[PDB]
Ligand binder design. Structure first.
Ligand SMILES: Nc1ncnc2c1ncn2[C@@H]1O[C@H](COP(=O)(O)OP(=O)(O)OP(=O)(O)O)[C@@H](O)[C@H]1O
Ligand SMILES: Nc1ncnc2c1ncn2[C@@H]1O[C@H](COP(=O)(O)OP(=O)(O)OP(=O)(O)O)[C@@H](O)[C@H]1O
Ligand SMILES: Nc1ncnc2c1ncn2[C@@H]1O[C@H](COP(=O)(O)OP(=O)(O)OP(=O)(O)O)[C@@H](O)[C@H]1O
Ligand SMILES: [K+]
Ligand SMILES: [K+]
Ligand SMILES: [K+]
Ligand SMILES: [Mg+2]
Ligand SMILES: [Mg+2]
Ligand SMILES: [Mg+2]
Lengths: 523, 523, 524
């Protein structure tokens, strides 16, 4: 259509106004004194959330240039959520600060590309300093504190994550689901976790989390791909009124041959799900047999010769609950037979003892680790559905932050890590003066998380930032208690992955955004 | 779409204005001197009701932020209705009071998260005090009093509930349905009650109660799930014009295929219903056989060898009336054969005797308990349909109240319980001053039910509140007579569950709502 | 006409919005790094100014309730201008801070009347602490520093005002007017220089200068107007016998008398020059008497009783030297008793004390400066008229501040005095908790000028305020150099009267505004 084309400072101030609207909506949520944002839903009741990426995703503006700025900055929060599941508000605050100071530098007349290069150099150096400053979670051993900080000073959630990880291992899968009582319940049940996703995005249910879930789903297993529709049409037709959603696990379902005609078939009564089988060959066949034994089902194979037309409901397996995500699909609880599960575990352990190859040994040890850990389920207790959603979001943030902490380490919370690495980069220089100004923009913007936390506390951000900068190491400011101290000792820990990801994504988007001279959008 | 984003006090006052509109509409109904609200209905005549959740559900506002506040507070009334089926108005009044005082505290500058934590701590302590204050409701007079109070001081409804529970047992099922006559009739007929719900929400009939009902539904029983459409197509085609809505009870029913093509089949002339069979295995087969004997039908099974096609209209059973709800499905009256039902009761009882296992004995005695109790049907007598709906609402409320009363006990009515619990929590303190202010907000809001009752009486809520606070124990104010006295002696009893639920849901939603700094909604 | 009525939080929010509009327009000028505000004028070019009172005067809002708030807070700047002539921006900033904190307190449910009482108590204690903290400003160096600070760090203005005050003295009068040149000029005239020229051009003794120069002349002071030579004829004959020149001050000399005086002027019998008396009714007689006292003469009037035919040489006044030009008359070293001059000056001082009008008081002080001391005129030099107006406003501010400094002393500038006073009042308490909160909001508002100055420099107000509070005595933050030091040593001095007046007026107005619960105004 006809285009509105804006240039220079007019385009940049419109972009900054949209950035500021999104970033203020997100930034009111930052920190332990951060407040909740109500997001209206046409679906049902409004969602009350402290989660910055949710707020950012809901933001969309009427002015088209402001809307472009808001969408571009919204990418920062969405990328932080996708990468680490936490620190999305910190990432948005960093992005807004970089954008504001970089646009001020552009107004001062510095070359925006050189400003972007300076920002990128400063952020690379800051990522290196964050890696150097990071204390591994094994040495610190403060998983409960990380979960508490991520769950907004909810010590119960932090202790729940700590118990779940001490029970199912630091790498075992943990799933957050809606409970039924007022209290949070930890349930270490038998389950399986594999890193695969759905073939099509049309299997997404009414919830907007992007992960499909099934109530007591059916289990169908196959290593050899089927040849015609009539061979599996009886299995789908059988599950037709079997109140257990047919979860098909095979190599790679063609959406045109299942999803299209099934969508023409059902209007949404039940969500037939198809997922990819990870691995290949004999490893995939062994995993399929293990999953069938877990769920009580059987695997169809050409060598065996047993056919889907001969398959019945009793032959196939089942799982109490299954959650399928693009990143990783988890089976929460499969009944099967406990004695059969234990016998299969013993057989796989004997296979480990018999095998001597490194690849076979490591894959079989991954198998036994998955079977031993099972699935930890955290039931979220809440009186109402809006409290349920808020608390579940906070528990998801705590789980993501604890996972990131065990993956990469911890640093001082409350923006102190960024303050410290900015102080160590005070001597960083670029190839020219505009690159040096970009470096200084990045270093000043690294203060923005702490200052926004202090503003949300209603305290004086400049005074607290000065006091923290005058300190050293993990010295910082406890916003929950409004006093200074060693942040590690007070338990205010941030995952190094979360801080690094927030800084990197905010830097990339904001550095690109400060280089924009022209904006083209619909009238 | 483009979003209207409001912050701070503007967002909070819009939210409070919407809360106030919904809460005033609901609160005019509170107490004995509460008045009726007319809810316009597009389908037909307006409904006149004194129920609070109905009014709250109908409230929806033009201003989008006020609408956000109204929907969030409406969740309180809907949650209370779902939990105890009574106390929705009290819950709304509590939620509005907490919201108002918490927003005043936020304007005073207290940290809203700490206010929410104080409210939650006060409400937890208040739930403990409600359990301590509760007195077991184990008398027929007490049950009658609870029903009378819950039926807007209708002693006839209270006595009807008391007689129904003294006849079918304090746990036997009781169903409220319209009566042709102008008088309320108690009918203790044989019936079956099982805790299961419909597979799909597409079986909901015209009435908005969320429970489907069938006129003389046909009964079909199965423990083995079907494989193809053609096995049951003669049964569906038969009942098609047999004259009885086909109620299908099977192991694990599903509508994936059934619901879509059946909806494509009928346009709504008659309602085909499918429900899950509770339990599993031999227990489910025994229950299915019992239901088939009750309704005169037979249970198709692979072991039996019978098939749906083989079954004729005479072979299959029927029920005078069936009401299916998500929580619990009841068969009001399954004719069958009285001699058959008797003989089956004697057989099952002998099975209980013969049996020695604790699980077997318990389930067996539960079976005979259901058979003996049957269903107590209360026919609501009204001259007109609007009076029918109003009186049926009040009878439903009385039934839910009496149920909760026998389950969890009774406390002083007229908001006296909350007053007493607030007086006992006067010494409760939090971790900081904002938490203490939140505790005080909760304690002050616990007075709101009594004050609103007094306002509906047209009396002075402050004077009555102070007079009740000056007293102790079950001392309160009889609003029906405008005189003070012992609430228990005067018969003004509230179910402890109802009071606790109202308080908990109001607290959860209102504590979340007072923490909101930003609101995002469509323009 | 029909009225719009608003109550409680809504009315207070609209009032605060209007106050904030006015204060945001004004506070951008506070401090050395403060900027200029352009005020559109329906007539002439727009005015560029760095004065809070002008910006505040121009502010008027469309929203009626916001306009109410703006007008009320505009009273602060107007009153500060009226009393001290400086500090109007500091006063508007203080009023905005008090209003903001007090409205916050009202939103917390505290009684606004008690908040106002606490604010009043804190401000009274603050005025006492300012008086205690003030130091005299009598040296010319401190006066120059005060003028420089009040002129937006224009050392030339401060030094010029210091020189003017040193010349004219304590009783001297200094006025600021436009100058033709690009440079500021100081013109000081001593003794009597009343603005009346020769009644006849031919009286000019010195043609190359176009002025009459009389050496040791007699002075004739007649309160009446004359047109005939008969009545002064004995006086003229006596003067001619004496041989010294004569100067006539009278309501008017014209016709035959003037012509005869001129003819005798050329003929040389008597060196005579006649000029009009100064001023108008009720004042002209006072001027004549002042001149008689200076020159040791007597005024010839019909009210007093004496006639001019009976006037003698002893009746005539005496002066050392006289200069008549077309525009003004100058008398040098009038031969009159000193004690009489001091007595007449004391009577005029008593009239000043009795006077209740600005015009009357300035005219009486001008008369005093004519009798004793001197009168100075500062011609402001600027390249254009907009620059002329801006510089004239700054010079008038500097002059007002220097007069205030001489009257009541100086305190540390840069909002440091208010910071120290608020620190000294931390223990002050009221009758109840609401009064205590009012005291606290007044004390916190006392930090507003320093914070706004720092904000106008682009720095962090909170950090600088904390650093200044951590200091003691006159330690402060020089905004011009962005450095810390002794405000007195770096020459950042604020008149005690200016600071006290700003605090007092802002407190009174703001305290009344926070007490508002309803607003009544015309509908839109
Ligand atoms: N008590 C505390 N004192 C100081 N800083 C704290 C405290 N608790 C948490 N923080 C800091 O607050 C930040 C986390 O704030 P918040 O959880 O609101 O946002 P986020 O994690 O960046 O994003 P989001 O939760 O929206 O994904 C971290 O920098 C953390 O170290
Ligand atoms: N005669 C009475 N005197 C005093 N209080 C009474 C009397 N009758 C009932 N109440 C009180 O009135 C309250 C019940 O009010 P009401 O039945 O109007 O609404 P509700 O139970 O809160 O909600 P709903 O809309 O679900 O019916 C209880 O607290 C009960 O104790
Ligand atoms: N170099 C400086 N460093 C610090 N403070 C300074 C400096 N120069 C001036 N100030 C302070 O600026 C304040 C007044 O400056 P300004 O002329 O902007 O406002 P004002 O006198 O309050 O207003 P107005 O001239 O409109 O009546 C005083 O407190 C003075 O001490
Ligand atoms: K957040
Ligand atoms: K009611
Ligand atoms: K100024
Ligand atoms: Mg977080
Ligand atoms: Mg009720
Ligand atoms: Mg000034």
């Amino acid at each position: 259509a006809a285009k509105d084309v804006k240039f220079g400072n007019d385009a940049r101030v419109k972009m900054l106004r949209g950035v500021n609207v999104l970033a203020d909506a997100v930034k009111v949520t930052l920190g332990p004194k951060g407040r909740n944002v109500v997001l209206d839903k046409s679906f049902g009741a409004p969602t009350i959330t402290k989660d910055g990426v949710s707020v950012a995703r809901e933001i969309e503006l009427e002015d088209k240039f402001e809307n472009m700025g808001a969408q571009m900055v919204k990418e920062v929060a969405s990328k932080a959520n996708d990468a680490a599941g936490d620190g999305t508000t910190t990432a948005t605050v960093l992005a807004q600060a970089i954008i504001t100071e970089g646009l001020k530098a552009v107004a001062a007349g510095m070359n925006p590309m050189d400003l972007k290069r300076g920002i990128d150099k400063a952020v690379t150096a800051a990522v290196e300093e964050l890696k150097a400053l990071s204390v591994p979670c094994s040495d610190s051993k403060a998983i409960a504190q990380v979960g508490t900080i991520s769950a907004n000073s909810d010590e119960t959630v932090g202790k729940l994550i700590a118990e779940a990880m001490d029970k199912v291992g630091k790498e075992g899968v943990i799933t957050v689901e809606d409970g039924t009582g007022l209290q949070d319940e930890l349930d270490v049940v038998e389950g399986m976790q594999f890193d695969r996703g759905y073939l099509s995005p049309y299997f997404i249910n009414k919830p907007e989390t992007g992960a499909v879930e099934l109530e007591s789903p059916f289990i169908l297993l196959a290593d050899k791909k089927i040849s015609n529709i009539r061979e599996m049409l009886p299995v789908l037709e059988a599950v037709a009124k079997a109140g257990k959603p047919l979860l098909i696990i095979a190599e790679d379902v063609e959406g045109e041959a299942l999803a299209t005609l099934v969508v023409n078939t059902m209007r949404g009564i039940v969500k037939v799900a198809a997922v990819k089988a990870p691995g290949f060959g004999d490893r995939r066949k062994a995993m399929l047999q293990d999953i069938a034994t877990l769920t009580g089902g059987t695997v169809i194979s050409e060598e065996i010769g047993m056919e889907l037309e001969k398959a019945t409901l009793e032959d196939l397996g089942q799982a109490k609950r299954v959650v399928i995500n693009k990143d990783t699909t988890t089976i929460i609880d499969g009944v099967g037979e406990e004695a059969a599960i234990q016998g299969r575990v013993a057989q796989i352990r004997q296979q480990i003892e018999e095998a001597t190859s490194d690849y076979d040994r490591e894959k079989l040890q991954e198998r036994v680790a998955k079977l031993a850990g099972g699935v930890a389920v955290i039931k979220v207790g809440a009186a109402t559905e809006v409290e349920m959603k808020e608390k579940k979001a906070r528990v998801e943030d705590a789980l993501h932050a604890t996972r990131a902490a065990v993956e990469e380490g911890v640093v001082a919370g409350g923006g102190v890590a960024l303050i410290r690495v900015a102080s160590k980069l005070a001597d960083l220089r670029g190839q020219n003066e505009d690159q040096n100004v970009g470096i200084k923009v990045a270093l000043r913007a690294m203060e923005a998380p702490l200052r926004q936390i202090v503003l949300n506390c209603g305290e004086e951000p400049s005074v607290v930032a000065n006091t923290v900068k005058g300190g050293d190491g993990n010295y910082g400011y406890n916003a929950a208690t409004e006093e200074y101290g060693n942040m590690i000792d007070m338990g205010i820990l941030d995952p190094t992955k979360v801080t690094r990801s927030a800084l990197q994504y905010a830097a990339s988007v904001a550095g690109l955004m400060i280089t924009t001279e022209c904006m083209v959008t619909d009238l």
